[PDB]
Paper text:
The genome-organizing protein p6 of Bacillus subtilis bacteriophage φ29 plays an essential role in viral development by activating the initiation of DNA replication and participating in the early-to-late transcriptional switch. These activities require the formation of a nucleoprotein complex in which the DNA adopts a right-handed superhelix wrapping around a multimeric p6 scaffold, restraining positive supercoiling and compacting the viral genome. Additionally, p6 forms dimers that bind to DNA every 24 nucleotides and interact with the viral DNA through the minor groove. In this work, we have shown that protein p6 showcases a remarkable evolutionary design that encompasses a folded core as its foundation, upon which, two structural regions play crucial roles in dimerization and oligomerization.
Residue numbers in the entry: 1 to 83
């Protein structure tokens, strides 16, 4: 009767990087990145390989979270254009 809806889904991708520290290979903790849609582990790793060409970047986890932005229909008529 009164409610509308609009869904936004984003996947938070946690990444890590091999780096040289004092002549040893160690793991840099990278800031997590967020993308639009629901990405699997394989999808995210493909994106990371696209974004960081040749870099030793590992996707370590993917976390999808979906938000449902809703507005009363009455609220929408106030701002929408008749078109």
């Amino acid at each position: 009767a009164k409610m509308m809806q609009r869904e936004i889904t984003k996947t938070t991708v946690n990444v890590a990087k091999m780096v040289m520290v004092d002549g040893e290979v160690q793991v840099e903790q990278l800031p997590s990145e967020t993308f639009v849609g629901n990405l699997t582990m394989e999808q995210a790793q493909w994106r990371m390989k696209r974004k960081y060409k040749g870099e030793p970047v590992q996707v370590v986890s993917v976390e999808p979270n979906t938000e449902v932005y809703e507005l009363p229909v009455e609220k929408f008529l106030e701002v929408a254009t008749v078109r």
